[PDB]
Amino acid sequence: KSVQVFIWLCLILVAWILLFNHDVKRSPAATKVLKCITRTLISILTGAFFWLVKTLLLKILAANFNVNNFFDRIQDSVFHQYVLQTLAWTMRVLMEALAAAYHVFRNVAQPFFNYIEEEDLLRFMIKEEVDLVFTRKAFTEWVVKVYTSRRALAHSLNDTKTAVKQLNKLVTAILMVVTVVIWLLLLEVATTKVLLFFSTQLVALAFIIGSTCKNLFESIVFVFVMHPYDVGDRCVVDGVAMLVEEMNLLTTVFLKLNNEKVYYPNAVLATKPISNYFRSPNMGETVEFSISFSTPVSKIAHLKERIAEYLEQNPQHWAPVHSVVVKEIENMNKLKMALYSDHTITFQENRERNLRRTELSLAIKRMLEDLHIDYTLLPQDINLT
Amino acid sequence: SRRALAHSLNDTKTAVKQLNKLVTAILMVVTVVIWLLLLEVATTKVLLFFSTQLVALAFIIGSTCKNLFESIVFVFVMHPYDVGDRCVVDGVAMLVEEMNLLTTVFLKLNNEKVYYPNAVLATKPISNYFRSPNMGETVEFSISFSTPV
Amino acid sequence: FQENRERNLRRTELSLAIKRMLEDLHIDYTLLPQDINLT
3-state SS of chain B is CHHHHHHHHHHHHHHHHHHHHHHHHHHHHHHHHHHHHHHCCCCHHHHHHHHHHHHHHHHHHHHHHHHHHHHHHHHHHHCCCCCCCEEEECCEEEEECCCCCCEEEEEECCCCEEEEEHHHHHHCCCEECCCCCCCCCCCCCCCCCCCCC
Measured in whole angstroms, the distance separating CA B100 from the mean position of its chain's CA atoms is: 6
Decide if B83 contacts B4 (C-beta within 8 A): yes
How many whole angstroms separate alpha carbon A321 and alpha carbon A310?
A: 12
Cβ–Cβ < 8 Å for A340, A286: yes
∠ CA B2-A346-A285, nearest 5°, is 85
Element (H, E) at C4: helix C4-25
User: How many CB atoms neighbour CB B60 within 10 A?
Assistant: 19
Say which DSSP state C2 is in: -
Q: How far apart are CA A276 and CA B31, in angstroms?
A: 41
Q: How far, in Å, CA of A233 to CA of A348, rounded?
A: 7
Q: What values do phi and psi take at B83, rounded to 5?
A: -70, 135
Q: CA A120, CA A84: separation in Å to the nearest integer?
A: 13
> Which residues sit opposite B116 in a β-bridge?
B104
User: For the sheet containing B103-108, what is the strand order?
Assistant: A261-265, A251-256, A240-244, A234-237, A274-276, B113-117, B103-108, B92-96, B86-89, B127-128
Find out whether B70 and B44 touch, Cβ atoms under 8 Å.
no
Query: For residue A364, what are the CA distances in angstroms to A214, A259, A308, B19, B40?
Result: 54, 31, 11, 52, 81
Which 3-state string (H, E, C) describes chain A?
A: CHHHHHHHHHHHHHHHHHHHCCCCCCCHHHHHHHHHHHHHHHHHHHHHHHHHHHHHHHHHHHHHHHHHHHHHHHHHHHHHHHHHHHCCHHHHHHHHCCHHHHHHHHHHCCCCCCCCCHHHHHHHCCHHHHHHHCCHHHHHHHHHHHHHHHHHHHHHHHHHHHHHHHHHHHHHHHHHHHHHHHHHHHHCCCCHHHHHHHHHHHHHHHHHHHHHHHHHHHHHHHHHHHCCCCCCCEEEECCEEEEECCCCCCEEEEEECCCCEEEEEHHHHHHCCEEECCCCCCCEEEEEEEEECCCCHHHHHHHHHHHHHHHHCCCCCEEEEEEEEEEEEECCCEEEEEEEEEECCCCCCHHHHHHHHHHHHHHHHHHHHHHCCCCCCCCCCEEEC
Shortest distance between the Cα of C27 and any Cα of chain A, in A, equals 9
Work out the burial of residue A298: count CB atoms within 10 Å of its CB; fewer than 13 is exposed, 13-18 middle, 19 or more buried.
exposed
Contact A226, B102 (CB under 8 A): yes
- The residues that bridge with B92 in the sheet, in sequence order, are B89
CB atoms within 10 A of CB B114: 21
Greatest pairwise CA separation for chain A in angstroms: 130
To one decimal, the resolution in angstroms is 3.7
Other residues' Cβ atoms within 10 Å of the Cβ of residue B76? 13
Cβ-Cβ contacts under 8 Å for B32 (sequence gap 6 or more): none
Do the Cβ atoms of A343 and A352 come closer than 8 Å? no
**Nearest-10 Cα torsion for A46, A51, A53, A58:** 170
Maximum C-alpha span of chain C: 62
Q: Is C27 helix (H, G, I), strand (E, B) or coil?
A: coil
| Nearest residue of C to residue B85, measured between CA atoms | C2
Determine the Cα–Cα distance for residues A174 and A101; give it in Å rounded to an integer. Answer: 49
- CB-based contacts of A222, cutoff 8 Å, min separation 6: A228, A266, A267, A269, A270
Strand, coil or helix: C3? coil
Gapped junctions in chain C, after residues (C–N > 2.5 Å): none
Whole-number CA gyration radius for chain B: 24
Measure Cα distances from A41 to A7, A10, A26, A65, B49 in Å. Answer: 13, 9, 21, 36, 19
Residues of chain A contacting B, Cβ within 8 Å: 178, 181-182, 185-186, 188, 195, 199, 202-203, 206, 210, 213-214, 217-218, 221, 225-226, 228, 236, 270-271, 273-277, 279-284, 286, 328-332, 342, 347
Which of B43, B103, B142 comes nearest A226 by C-beta? B103
Closest CA to A291 of A315, A261, A327: A327
Rounded to a whole number of angstroms, the distance from the CA of C28 to the nearest CA of chain B is: 6
Q: Determine whether the interchain pair B115/A273 forms a contact, defined as Cβ–Cβ distance below 8 Å.
A: yes
The residue type at A30: A
**Number of neighbouring beta carbons within 10 Å of residue A342:** 18
Chain centroid, CA A259 distance in Å: 19
C28: which DSSP letter?
A: -
Q: Which residue, among B108, B111, B126, would best test binding to A if mutated, counting the most A CBs under 10 Å from its CB?
A: B111
Neighbours of A140 (CB within 10 A): 18
Among residues A73, A80, A141, which one has the least CA distance to residue A106? Answer: A141
Subunits with at least 3 CB pairs below 8 A relative to chain A? B, C
Residues of B with CB under 8 A from a CB of A: 43, 45-46, 49, 52-53, 56, 59-61, 63-64, 102-103, 107-117, 120, 139-143
**Chain B residues close to C14, C-beta within 8 Å:** 137, 139
**Cα separation of A146 and A154, whole Å?**
12
Backbone angles phi, psi at A258, to 5 degrees: -90, 10
Side-chain-side CA neighbours of residue B88 (13 Å): 12
User: Chains touching chain B at 3 or more Cβ pairs under 8 angstroms?
Assistant: A, C
Residue type, C6: E
- Whole-angstrom Cα distance, residue C22 to residue A255? 52
Residues B60 and A210: beta-carbon distance below 8 Å:
yes
Q: Å from B86 to nearest chain C CA? A: 6
Measured CA distances, A149 to A143, A232, A256, B90, B130 (Å)? 10, 9, 20, 36, 39
C-beta of residue A94 within 8 angstroms of C-beta of residue A74: yes
Q: Which pairing describes strands A284-292 and B127-128: parallel, antiparallel, or unpaired? A: unpaired
Query: Which residue of C29, C37, C38, C39 is the best one to mutate when testing the A interface, meaning the one whose CB has the most A CBs within 10 A?
Result: C29
Q: CA neighbours within 13 Å on the CB side: how many for A109?
A: 18
Q: A57 vs A90, A309, B22, C10, C24, CA distance in Å?
A: 22, 57, 14, 55, 75
Q: What is the distance between the alpha carbons of residues A49 and A340, in angstroms, rounded to a whole number?
A: 60
- What CA–CA distance (Å, rounded) separates A104 from C12? 54
Helix (H, G, I), strand (E, B) or coil at C34: strand
